[PDB]
Nucleic acid binder design. Structure first.
Lengths: 555, 411
DNA sequence: CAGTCCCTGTTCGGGCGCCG
DNA sequence: GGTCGGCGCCCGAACAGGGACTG
């Protein structure tokens, strides 16, 4: 067997474990013909070699159809090998995005063929890549081969190819520094600001530099004229857009179908602004079977129809211009949902997106807005390596009030206010000093861990009082209920004294939404008030009326 | 032609496998230029996917510095080689460094590139350089010499370092020199003028052996932040409730604190804004508690075998308080920072500056870096903290969310 | 005192989408 | 078909760790 012009990556097994010894699956007669036809061809080209009984290893093998072609692809079930092979550190850290490309005079795209089959495998490792090819007769012993290249289906093949490919491009990129080469597996986006005459020269020079190592660049996949098909997009000299997306039109929707729907809906949200998947993801909660038919809710059918109406109109993105600033603007779409658009010129969106993670049981719009900004910041640094300037639907004074008074560290990069309702604001402000002339409520609440019963109430300085029996509750729910009572039976200005750190830690965070209905009722009463002062005192210390109301709600 | 010191991980532990976070453009261009240069000087060499280990890498600019500096987050590797630099080749900590009038820090990380690293250990120093928009796959490297920011580097170079410092330590015996990570702390009681001169004498004393910085500290002017009670002449119900809550919380530190007579003033169900006169038994319980807060806590002392822990509280208006301890309520040191860079506009910058100042103080006093309890969300911190880091070391930290309770450390 | 449990947050396992 | 790797989303489950309470 000849030596492959590319250097080979040394691969070991994990210490203490031997190669795989798995029996072959029964294969359909149509797949056996496709395998023997491809086996016998790769052995002629020096890619697989025969092995005798001295190789005690074996692994299953099968074959699937190629997309839009009569050819078949050979795949090996290395699930037992991959467990015992050494761990690899992948060199693909993410996926390129067209919004990060710069306008170049000339653009060329090519795709080498049978990529993994042009890179050798380590010599000392070929013994563990042994497999059997079952013949048309079950009594025939079968032909046994071993791989000489990267087997399609092995966990080290993508890692090894990307690193081997980068090593071959380095001498070209070192000699041609002004040539931009976007390398993602076997596909090379090549662009330059050189004239179209000296462009094609450097293209041919690469196609020969790649040929010297056994990498063929067929003219069938060569692309010299726009539009270019790169990474699932359509690259034009001035704009770009995703390749057409097709949503299922199922009359009876199963859980898996929504999952394929949602997954697609996401894929689109990167350029199609305004995609909402709130009510559609509400169908995937608490469900167990992937094939369990599920009826669409009224809110989900409306959300789907809107999304189908957005996919009808054509949308497109632009490219990154380093000379002009990066801008990102966010809007408040649904409760718990956010969308954004990244652009440099008005209405010329580089890309869009959405953020909707519900973080925590109690939160407000300001928290979710800060979480959204951070998600955009990281994503932007991935694609453009810089933080965009932000246009936020929150008043400057609103945000200044929040971050200065919040006990956690919080910050937003350079941003400016945009008057696009609905505006994010704080729905209530707790006073910092007790209110003069306001009734003072000493609240407390307790419950029994066994009976699950408790009381909650208050005592005021004007003699007012209340105690309410509560059934199927906890100590925390009662202390919260006691505060809800004080808010109900008080005027517009009220001073409230509690001994519950749990209740005080939730309210001081100024939440406007909560997963608990009792908190939402407390929020609704807090918005109706003009001035509210909360205070904490240690319990069981005989403090004010907090000890008098502790003894009333004791049982 | 130098012999390599053999190093091994701690028993029963694999190398670090931490993913590389996304980097900005100005950082990637700085790492490329440095790494290409370090590759040309043989300090590093390219590797492949067969190495399953990786460590994050980013770049910084020290205070009032224009040149970028390569920095590696070897916190995970240092945890997995802890027995080497503490048991076999430990460095003593001078208890007099914190008593000097002026201490200066010197980046000596460039000297570690003169000593080759053990061949079998180079596999764990692996790191990956990302590209913008993932144009190219990860450009991986590994170290061929003593890496900057690794705890095992100053321990191997210690024998060589002592011989370089001996001619200067003999001429200047009263000067204290400590070495932590890639920095060298030189403290002296000399006047500020002749102090900086002796620094330049050292700087040239290290240039002749094959090695520059300048950050002055004044550990003798370091103050602590005690717990203080208000000196009001007219006390309202609310004032007394806040006072009792604060005294009740402070009782976990000073067992001698009592709130019996003050709680007696809070018997009736009174309005918060109502003024209450302090009884004779309460004015004495208040004055006695002010004196107990003047006394030092009983039974507090540093334990070298225990990990340091630091808590930070945002007090607003550019105010930040901190406490260092090993056992709860046994605070080795307290303090407060104000008017740091980014005050009144940026809270992550202030929190980043506060961690660096606290860590620097912990190195001068005990020679250890504390584990921080940061008052910030995890996602907020991990997004911006690298944009304000100006130090060659990186402490450990965790994220807490304690609502304020009774403002115990700041009035 | 040490054990719970009430609550809240994080990490992870598993489904699509996409790319080669 | 029921291969690999990368990234993204959504969900529940498992695990975690703090606070108040009674044995």
């Amino acid at each position: 067997v000849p030596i492959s012009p590319i250097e080979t990556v040394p691969v070991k097994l994990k210490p203490g474990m031997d190669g795989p010894k798995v029996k072959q699956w029964p294969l359909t007669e149509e797949k056996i013909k496709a395998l023997v036809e491809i086996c016998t061809e790769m052995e002629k080209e020096g890619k697989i070699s025969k092995i005798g009984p001295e190789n005690p290893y074996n692994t299953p093998v099968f074959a699937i159809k190629k997309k839009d072609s009569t050819k078949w692809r050979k795949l090996v079930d290395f699930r037992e090998l991959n467990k015992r092979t050494q761990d690899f550190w992948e060199v693909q850290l993410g996926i390129p995005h067209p919004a990060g490309l710069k306008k170049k005079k000339s653009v060329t795209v090519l795709d080498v063929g049978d990529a993994y089959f042009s890179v050798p495998l380590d010599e000392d490792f070929r013994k563990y890549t042994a497999f059997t090819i079952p013949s048309i007769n079950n009594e025939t012993p079968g032909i046994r081969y071993q791989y000489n290249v990267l087997p399609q289906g092995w966990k080290g093949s993508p890692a090894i190819f990307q690193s081997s490919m980068t090593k071959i491009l380095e001498p070209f990129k070192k000699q041609n520094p002004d040539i931009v080469i976007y390398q993602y597996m076997d596909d090379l986006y090549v662009g330059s600001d050189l004239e179209i005459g000296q462009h094609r020269t450097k293209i041919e020079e690469l196609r020969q530099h790649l040929l010297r190592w056994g990498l063929t660049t067929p003219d069938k996949k060569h692309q010299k004229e726009p539009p270019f098909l790169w990474m699932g997009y359509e690259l034009h000299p001035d704009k770009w857009t995703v390749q057409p997306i097709v949503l299922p039109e199922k009359d009876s929707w199963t859980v898996n179908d929504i999952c394929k729907l949602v997954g697609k809906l996401n894929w689109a949200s990167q350029i199609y602004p305004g995609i909402k998947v709130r009510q559609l993801s509400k169908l995937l909660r608490g469900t167990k079977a992937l094939t369990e038919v599920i009826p669409l809710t009224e809110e989900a059918e409306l959300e789907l129809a809107e999304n189908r109406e957005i996919l009808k109109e054509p949308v497109h993105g632009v490219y990154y211009d380093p000379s002009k600033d990066l801008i990102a603007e966010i809007q408040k779409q649904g409760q718990g949902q956010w969308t954004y658009q990244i652009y440099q010129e008005p209405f010329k969106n580089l890309k869009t997106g959405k953020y909707a993670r519900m973080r925590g049981a109690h939160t407000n719009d300001v928290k979710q807005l800060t979480e959204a900004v951070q998600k955009i910041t990281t994503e932007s640094i991935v694609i453009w390596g810089k933080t965009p300037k932000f246009k936020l639907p929150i008043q400057k004074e609103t945000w200044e009030t929040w971050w200065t008074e919040y006990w956690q560290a919080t910050w937003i990069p350079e941003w400016e206010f945009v008057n696009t309702p609905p505006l994010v604001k704080l729905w209530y402000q707790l006073e910092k000093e007790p209110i003069v002339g306001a009734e003072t409520f000493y609240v407390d609440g307790a419950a029994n861990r066994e009976t699950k019963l408790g009381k909650a109430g208050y005592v005021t300085n004007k003699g007012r009082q209340k105690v309410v029996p509560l059934t199927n509750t906890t100590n925390q729910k009662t202390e919260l209920q006691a505060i809800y009572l004080a808010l109900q039976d008080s005027g517009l200005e009220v001073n409230i004294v509690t001994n519950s750190q749990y209740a005080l830690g939730i309210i001081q965070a100024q939440p406007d939404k909560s997963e608990s209905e009792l908190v939402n009722q407390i929020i609704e009463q807090l918005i109706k008030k003009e001035k509210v002062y909360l205070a904490w005192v240690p319990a069981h210390k005989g403090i004010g009326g907090n000890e008098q109301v502790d003894k009333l709600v004791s049982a | 032609p130098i012999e390599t010191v053999p190093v091994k991980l701690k028993p029963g532990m694999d190398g670090p496998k931490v993913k590389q976070w996304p980097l900005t453009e100005e950082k990637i261009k700085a790492l490329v230029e440095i790494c290409t240069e370090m590759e040309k000087e043989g300090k590093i060499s390219k590797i492949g996917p067969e190495n399953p280990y990786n460590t994050p890498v980013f770049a910084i600019k020290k205070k009032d510095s224009t040149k970028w500096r390569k920095l590696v987050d070897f916190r995970e590797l240092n945890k997995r080689t802890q027995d080497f630099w503490e048991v076999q080749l430990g460095i003593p900590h001078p208890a007099g460094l914190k008593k000097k009038k002026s201490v200066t820090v010197l980046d000596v990380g460039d000297a570690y590139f003169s000593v080759p690293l053990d061949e079998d250990f180079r596999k764990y120093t692996a790191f990956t350089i990302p590209s913008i928009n993932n144009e190219t796959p990860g450009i991986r490297y590994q170290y061929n010499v003593l890496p900057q920011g690794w705890k095992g580097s100053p321990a191997i170079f210690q024998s060589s370092m002592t011989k370089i410092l001996e001619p200067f330590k003999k001429q200047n015996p009263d000067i204290v020199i400590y070495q932590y990570m890639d920095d060298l702390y030189v403290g002296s009681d000399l006047e500020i003028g002749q102090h900086r001169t002796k620094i330049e004498e050292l700087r040239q004393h290290l240039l002749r052996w094959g090695l520059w910085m300048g950050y002055e500290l004044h550990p003798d002017k370091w103050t602590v932040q005690p717990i203080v009670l208000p000196e009001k002449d007219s006390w309202t119900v609310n004032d007394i409730q806040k006072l009792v809550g604060k005294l009740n919380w402070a009782s976990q530190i000073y067992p001698g604190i009592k709130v019996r007579q003050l709680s007696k003033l809070l018997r009736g169900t009174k309005a918060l804004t109502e003024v209450i006169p302090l009884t004779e038994e309460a004015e004495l319980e208040l004055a006695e508690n002010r004196e107990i807060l003047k006394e030092p806590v009983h039974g507090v002392y540093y334990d070298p075998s225990k990990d340091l822990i630091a808590e930070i509280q945002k007090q607003g208006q550019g105010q930040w308080t901190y406490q260092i301890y090993q056992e709860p309520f046994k605070n080795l040191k307290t303090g407060k920072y104000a008017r740091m860079r980014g005050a009144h506009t940026n809270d992550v910058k202030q929190l980043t500056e506060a961690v660096q100042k606290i860590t620097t103080e912990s190195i001068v006093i005990w020679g250890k870096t504390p584990k921080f309890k940061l008052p910030i969300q995890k996602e907020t911190w991990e997004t911006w903290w690298t944009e304000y880091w100006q130090a060659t070391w990186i402490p450990e930290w965790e994220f807490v969310n304690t609502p304020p309770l009774v403002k115990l450390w700041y009035q």
